[PDB]
Subunit: 333 residues, 3 copies
């Protein structure tokens, strides 16, 4: 009887950060209560000032990472304020039935709904809006995020021994299809409905104009670089709701990788790069061994360095000359 | 001595259905006799009336699913009637030698051939036509299907315990490259040879115009939706002879997935989405837990909902409110 | 203390061949010394005479395969002669820290550098140039190769038993983005810097003009076909530094495949086709069972047979009619 279970309210945080949780469940099964407010907003996605009408869960692209344990109940209050213009809904790939919830959560501006589902399968999973007849338009407007369903006993390696992260980040990767004029210039629009009228043609090229982490070119760089220390264990959850990606930590590895995101499977070891299919979340665990700057990319390097799918880590600590050293620094002789 | 083995004749059925077979082999090794007749035909592939010249095995796109057991012999009588205009052949990815059979099966209109191969490796496998110098043209005209080579003891899970399906469907996914005029309009042609003259240029864009299940937009919907009941175990075999796909059951999962199709490997568990590389067949097992409408898609949602890679299930039975429920239905307060 | 270890000098050979090595380490850990000389050169990449300015390690596309054992030290002397025009560097995906070495190896024309790293993880790995702000341009100009880090006890199967290859080949697959005029014609240029000015636009289409093995259409065919005999065990290492591929042996299989290249993981068995993500090396083991001509392709058959991602094997020996036979040769009746 679900009414006899504990309820716990979670307040979500902005990606790439992740709300506080326990890896190993410190209670029995609970109803975990989340609230997300839909926000349609203009967003500037590149250094040039290109503006799109983003469709967001909780004001961000991606939407925030939700975290529960296997056989918890997720109870989501989804709010569509009357300041918005479109109907929206939510499909959880973690959930079973009713198109992942999409059939039960259609909210017009000025409406709200509350969905409950049982998180029966452990893993990271995409969630995304999916209104009938407008599915790729909403997803590729940014209206997607992810949920992590941890095993109740936390993460385990390929031999059954604990894997415990010290830090967790959520990298949402977004393909955008900004329509162009005949010469190749990106259009701007006053409303999402105006933007929609060029959108299907732009999408059907299957060629994104931009591919970004955390909603913009350069978002995970500078003062917003990801951080770690030598010795620290970091889990990077990575989602792509619509298009394949191939994550790679430049100067590191995925020591343990669930490339398709599902923790009942043993992780792949020692990956350089891995394929997260479109419509999936994946997760990589790494223990840092060297300080300095890393880049974290989609390793189609055009998509990374020309279209925006690149972020940085800044890692503190002790350089290991056993692991790597410059024997003769660049010089002319 | 193969002449001492039983011969069994199979009559094939139209996809997405699958000819009757036994999961666990009820005889020893056999010579399993199949006949396929090649048919070049006009097909309408979308709601708009776009017509292509399809090159088919047995009148369908995809070609029918053939089913045998490991170490059976497949004996295929391939017929190319003189009503056709082109040379064709067949390459089985299940087979060993002679380009999978392609080097031994070149049939002009008015000819037939019979190929025999030993099915030495268990899995689902693509078969496709592959005439020298014209390979992608025939494949992307629809001339591809799949063969399932079951282990003699049937399917097993990641721990070695039986997996027994109640129902099986075959979803062939086809990328088409319909040539356009300068403004973007799709051309029609009177013959396959006329169509061929614009085909290489269209293919070289690497951008399909259409991506469909069972040969047309909407083919697996309406009166032709796939069906199941709550509690039923369903195996969905999915092939793509030329281009990657990423299958996803909207509102479900792949409980057990052989994403690259080969049953000596343990399946991946609890997949949301998986990557079937171009040139591969994959297979997903799911036990339905909720009634209602599901969609089954390529989860590049543009490819699904704009280009045609989407079908439906209609599932009967008892809704499970433990698994999912609307706590507060959409409303304004 | 690294100064107490043996040093061994390796002289590299041109792909698809691989320098001589021992599968099972016959010494303890060593410092393995390699020298590569950067060469910018014009290369003709197709049958039509299309010319690009290739940026090469050691004169070839791909760069040569380097082979060491786990916990050896790789010591690379990288030479950028003053006959070249650009700054280059090298990132090893096998290495840990400093962007895989890229941050420590920036060499102007007329300079050299020596990098040492510890090969702590077994597998095949991409290496590539990666100059800040010019990364995809150098990679997609051919400036990439691979390194194999063998386990000290050689390769093992999915049950822990030895896998010993008789022959090894390295297939580097290269996506090129040759800029076109308005009508679609490929441009030529006198220098790499002239070519660079159209390069970012060509890359941003995400649509290669050419996709080739060993640096040109048809490179691994004719007098340069790969060879084997019936019964021989062959390891094919395959890399793609920038873009996904899907290797397939036409008429064979990957009996054991590390599709993402890392030998601490059990191989996938009996693959028809597998996905090597862009930014990865993979490796397939096959024992030939039939003589004759095979093709080895990227199984996007357009990329194979129209854009150049196709090579051949010529295999000697005894045809096995149990495995495959023509029962009735093509004929009209
Ligand atoms: O490893 N980054 O190219
Ligand atoms: O789960 N379908 O977007
Ligand atoms: O198997 N080659 O299409
Ligand atoms: Cu929406
Ligand atoms: Cu979805
Ligand atoms: Cu054909
Ligand atoms: Cu094939
Ligand atoms: Cu370079
Ligand atoms: Cu790299």
């Amino acid at each position: 009887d679900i009414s006899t279970l504990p309820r716990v309210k979670v307040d979500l945080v902005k990606p790439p950060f992740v709300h506080a949780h326990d890896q190993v469940a410190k209670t029995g099964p609970r109803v975990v209560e989340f609230t997300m407010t839909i926000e349609e907003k203009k967003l500037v996605i590149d250094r040039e000032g290109t503006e799109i009408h983003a469709m967001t869960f909780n004001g961000s692209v991606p939407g925030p990472l939700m975290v529960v344990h296997e056989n918890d109940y997720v109870e989501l209050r989804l709010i569509n304020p009357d300041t918005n213009t479109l109907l929206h809904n939510i499909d959880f790939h973690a959930a079973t039935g009713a198109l992942g919830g999409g059939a039960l959560t259609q909210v017009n501006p000025g409406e709200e709904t509350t969905l409950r589902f049982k998180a029966t399968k452990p893993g990271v999973f995409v969630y995304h809006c999916a209104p009938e007849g407008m599915v790729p338009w909403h997803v590729t407007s940014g209206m997607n995020g992810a949920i992590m369903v941890l095993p109740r006993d936390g993460l385990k390696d390929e031999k059954g021994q604990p894997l415990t992260y010290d830090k967790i980040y959520y990298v949402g990767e977004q393909d955008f299809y900004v329509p162009k004029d005949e010469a190749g210039n990106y259009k701007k629009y006053e409303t999402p409905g105006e933007a929609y009228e060029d959108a299907v043609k732009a999408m059907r090229t299957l060629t994104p104009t931009h591919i970004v982490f955390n909603g913009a070119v350069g978002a995970l760089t500078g003062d917003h670089a990801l951080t770690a220390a030598v010795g620290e264990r970091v889990l990077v959850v990575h989602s792509q709701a619509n298009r394949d990606t191939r994550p790679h930590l430049i100067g590191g590895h995925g020591d343990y990788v669930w490339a398709t995101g599902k923790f009942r499977n043993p992780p792949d070891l020692d990956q350089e790069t891995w394929l997260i299919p479109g419509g999936t979340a994946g997760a990589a665990f790494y223990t840092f061994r060297q300080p300095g700057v890393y880049a974290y990319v989609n390793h189609n390097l055009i998509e990374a360095f020309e279209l925006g799918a690149a972020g940085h880590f800044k890692v503190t600590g002790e350089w290991n000359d056993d692991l790597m050293t410059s024997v003769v620094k660049p010089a002319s002789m």
